[PDB]
A paper describes a structure:
Enteroviruses contain conserved RNA structures at the extreme 5′ end of their genomes that recruit essential proteins 3CD and PCBP2 to promote genome replication. Here, we determined the crystal structures of the coxsackievirus B3 and rhinoviruses B14 and C15 REPLRs at 1.54, 2.2 and 2.54 Å resolution, revealing a highly conserved H-type four-way junction fold with co-axially stacked sA-sD and sB-sC helices that are stabilized by a long-range A•C•U base-triple.
Here, we crystallized and determined four additional structures from the CVB3, rhinovirus B14 (RVB14), and rhinovirus C15 (RVC15) REPLRs using a Fab-assisted RNA crystallography approach. Consistent with the CVB3–DLmut and CVB3–BLmut, the two RVC15 REPLR structures, RVC15–DLmut and RVC15–BLmut, were very similar (RMSD = 0.972 Å for the superposition of the common cores without sB and sD loops). For example, RVB14 is expected to form an sD triloop (UAU), and RVC15 and PV1 show sC pentaloops (CACGU) compared to a typical sD tetraloop (UNCG type, N = A, U, G or C) and sC triloop (NCA, N = A, U, G or C) found in other enteroviral REPLRs. Interestingly, with U41 being flipped out in the RVC15 REPLR, our CVB3, RVB14 and RVC15 REPLR crystal structures all essentially contain an sC triloop. Yet, the last adenosine within the sC loop (A40, A35, A38, in the CVB3, RVB14 and RVC15 crystallization constructs, respectively) is absolutely conserved across all enteroviral REPLRs. Notably, in all structures of these REPLRs, the modeling of the sB-loop was ambiguous due to the poor electron density map in the region, which suggests that the sB-loop with the highest crystallographic B-factors is more dynamic compared to the other areas within the enteroviral REPLR structures, indicating that stabilization of the sB-loop may be influenced by PCBP2 binding. However, despite these sequence and secondary structure differences, CVB3, RVB14 and RC15 REPLRs crystal structures showed the same consensus H-shaped topology with the sC and sD tertiary interactions through an A•C•U base-triple formation.
Author numbering:
A (entry chain L): 1 to 215
B (entry chain H): 3 to 230
The structure:
RNA sequence: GGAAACUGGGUAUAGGUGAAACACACCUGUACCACCCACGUGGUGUAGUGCUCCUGUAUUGGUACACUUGCACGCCAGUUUCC
């Protein structure tokens, strides 16, 4: 069979100075052929622990690894800011090798209501037969938010993508760009384009909106 | 560092295609260590792919690439290879190259990693982005809280690099992860928050470079016309 | 090539070591099996010589001629050094 590596939690929200533990359970025995990696955005992984619990050179000593049978736990004795990242786990007991799916680690803060901004399409773009309507949710935390597009109070669906920033380095917040894509032909057929946002910092949902062809 | 791994030759490949990756080593000889390929699709986790064991030549493959890939090495040129055949978009990932340590010091851990090179499996044509202004609101705020950006749409492959006033502007800037839209082209936007008091004078320019197609664009980003 | 050290029946298998997951090399165990004996908690390259020891064939105690046990060289094969 292929050995499975099952790594809880797959993300984790903690503060500087907390003890933390990522766990990685094995479908079969791997003796001690476990290794733990740390990866940061845009960057290769870096080794942290090799075999059971041995600490690859230069890695700080707040990093430890342990073992009970087929269950392995990376541990950080108190988080430092340079430690928030994703962490993987590998077995190399036998081929094919197997990586855990990672545990992203993120910084707990208090709730930040988003600042909501809506952008119509450029008239330059409308020269190309397409409209794009952009909605900005700015410096919010926690990460979960709701973005519904109502067009002449008709709720939309499946004509809009989105993406989220990584947690901000300074104030540890998130931001989001939702993009409604229309055809110019359909875009021009309607007036009130709106963006309605639900979040924990919002006592009631926030609508930013405009009218197609006002100033 | 002295020890380095440098992948090359990943790029754009249409499905059913054939790329070959090179991992070239410096500061150590690959013939005394085991060399590994490990891929990572965007936003996804890591995936061991294949490896090659020293002195034996013994190769090993993850079940998801069995039959399509081949890992090989060249001592004369201190380079590992990864021949890829029968490619498909599922295979779109950054393809890192790594090395197992020495048993006495780092067990079987992977202590040295290339940069990763990017394979994009897609039938899309290399294409330059189009950049459109996200203008500040006419209402904005009477106090200085305003928001603007650029929309960078329909380019291929990844990546782009966006800057504001050629690096001058960094504070309050978010450039969001690109989104692969159903046409197979990418699109992302970049924003920044600036004082509303600054709009009437300060000229904001986003700097867009899409390297894969030799494309730099700058858009001045003004307040909406008739917004006085 | 020169000399320097070791090593020695078969198949498996566990562990170690060699820049070493497998392979290859080496080292150490284990199990089993094939053979020698004088039959063991035994032994194990060798149709060689010498001493030895066991068992015979007997002949002219002596002597041959075998068989066996051990020891020492030699020879053979492998390994590791060092020029």
């Amino acid at each position: 069979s292929d050995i499975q590596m099952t790594q809880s939690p797959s993300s984790l929200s903690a503060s500087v100075g907390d003890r933390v533990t990522i766990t990685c359970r094995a479908s079969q025995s791997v003796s001690s052929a476990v290794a733990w990696y740390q990866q940061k955005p845009g960057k290769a992984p870096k080794l942290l622990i090799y075999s059971a619990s041995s600490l690859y050179s230069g890695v700080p000593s707040r990093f430890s690894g342990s073992r009970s049978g087929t269950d392995f736990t990376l541990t950080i004795s108190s988080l430092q800011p340079e430690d928030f990242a994703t962490y993987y786990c590998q077995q190399s007991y036998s081929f094919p090798s197997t990586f855990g799916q990672g545990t992203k680690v993120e910084i707990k803060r208090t709730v930040a209501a988003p600042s909501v901004f809506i952008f119509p399409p450029s008239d330059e773009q409308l020269k190309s037969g397409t409209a794009s309507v952009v909605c900005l949710l700015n410096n919010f935390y926690p990460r979960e938010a709701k973005v519904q597009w109502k067009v002449d109070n008709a709720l939309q669906s499946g004509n809009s993508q989105e993406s989220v920033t990584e947690q901000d380095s300074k104030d540890s917040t998130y931001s989001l760009s939702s993009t409604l894509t229309l055809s110019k032909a359909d875009y021009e057929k309607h007036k009130v384009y709106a963006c309605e946002v639900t979040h924990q910092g919002l006592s009631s949902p926030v609508t930013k909106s405009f009218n197609r062809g006002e100033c | 560092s002295e020890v380095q791994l440098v992948e090359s030759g990943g790029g754009l490949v249409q499905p059913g295609g054939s790329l070959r990756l090179s991992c070239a080593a410096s500061g150590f000889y690959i013939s005394y260590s085991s060399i590994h390929w490990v891929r990572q699709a965007p936003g996804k986790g890591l995936e061991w792919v294949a490896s090659i064991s020293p002195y034996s030549g013994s190769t090993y493959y993850a079940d998801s690439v069995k039959g399509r890939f081949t890992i090989s090495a060249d001592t004369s040129k201190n380079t590992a290879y990864l021949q890829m055949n029968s490619l498909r978009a599922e295979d779109t990932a950054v393809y890192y190259c790594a090395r197992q340590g020495y048993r006495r010091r780092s067990g079987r851990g992977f202590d040295y990693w290339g940069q990763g090179t990017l394979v994009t499996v897609s039938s899309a044509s290399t294409k330059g982005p189009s950049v459109f202004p996200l203008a500040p609101s006419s209402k904005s705020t009477s106090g200085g809280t305003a928001a603007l950006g650029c929309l960078v749409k329909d380019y291929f492959p990844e990546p782009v690099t966006v800057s504001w006033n050629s690096g001058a502007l960094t504070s309050g800037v978010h450039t969001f992860p690109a989104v692969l839209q159903s046409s197979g082209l990418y699109s992302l936007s970049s924003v920044v928050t600036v004082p509303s008091s600054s709009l009437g004078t300060q000229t904001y320019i986003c700097n867009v470079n899409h390297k894969p197609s030799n494309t730099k664009v700058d858009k001045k980003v003004e307040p909406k016309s008739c917004d006085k």
